Amino acid sequence: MRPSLSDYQHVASGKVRELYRVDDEHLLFVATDRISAFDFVLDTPIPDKGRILTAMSVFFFGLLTVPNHLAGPPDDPRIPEEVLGRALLVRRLDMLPVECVARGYLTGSGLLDYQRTGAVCGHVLPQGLGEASRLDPPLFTPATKADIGEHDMNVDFAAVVGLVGAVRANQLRDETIKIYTRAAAHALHKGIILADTKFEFGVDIEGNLVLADEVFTPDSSRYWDAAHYQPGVVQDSFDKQFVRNWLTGPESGWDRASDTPPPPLPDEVAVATRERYIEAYERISGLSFSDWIGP
Ligand SMILES: N#Cc1cncnc1N
């Protein structure tokens, strides 16, 4: 008999994810079906999104050889029925206060920082780069969380050293680039570019660096279709482009500039978006989402 979610203490709420205490050394990591676009959590959930992204994360944890926070199988009896397939039993870690970002391509705040200064997070780059330019080698572009409604703040390596220690900063940098490089090559082989990604790490009782959070999901990473990769223009979001096009199109009645909360999505846009998530998962994992556990 699976426990009720109400049996666990709620310890943290993020935009799309929830964290619960299971016991002194374990947490329940829960992905929801909520989707964010243009820095708004939208009214309309994407069916099965939490399950698909959990399946994705589990695949990539298994692909990477590095220590990670998983503490049980996806059907672990400590997982409540209501979140089965979109929740994981994980080891509680002392989390390091660094958003560990790898960028293989130049976009978003990385591109903006470069266009303003010629550098990103302390990396002085060649002249002549632009939107969706390939970055080789990939860059470690760490960030720190800001206030509730604010974007993360890009910082340089010295800032990371001041947060976690010199040797630990080195370790974060090296592991971030190593696992990004592996996952990105794997995805591209299957026709998907992982343009960038954001990791969080924690430390266990033995002082070991442990990969936590979710890894290489379309929420933590920019997914692009490789078949349409065209440097110099903004790449479509593999998963979210239908959502973005509808919100900013003539049928939504919404003005992006207004900063007013956007309206709910058409059901058919939500279902199409679910299909994109499944396609990305199945292409990258080589597995069938129909085999992934659920309620
Ligand atoms: N993910 C995650 C996490 C957060 N806080 C503490 N431990 C963890 N494994």
From Swiss-Prot:
Answer whether the UniProt record assigns the keyword Iron to this protein: no
Pfam families in UniProt: SAICAR_synt
For this protein, the record's CDD domains field holds: SAICAR_synt_Sc
Classify the source by domain of life. Answer: Bacteria
What is a single cellular component term in the Gene Ontology annotation?
cytoplasm
Pathway assignment reads: Purine metabolism; IMP biosynthesis via de novo pathway; 5-amino-1-(5-phospho-D-ribosyl)imidazole-4-carboxamide from 5-amino-1-(5-phospho-D-ribosyl)imidazole-4-carboxylate: step 1/2
- Biological processes, Gene Ontology terms: 'de novo' IMP biosynthetic process
Q: Which GO terms describe its molecular function?
A: ATP binding; phosphoribosylaminoimidazolesuccinocarboxamide synthase activity
Q: What is this protein called?
A: Phosphoribosylaminoimidazole-succinocarboxamide synthase
- Species, as recorded: Mycobacteroides abscessus (strain ATCC 19977 / DSM 44196 / CCUG 20993 / CIP 104536 / JCM 13569 / NCTC 13031 / TMC 1543 / L948)
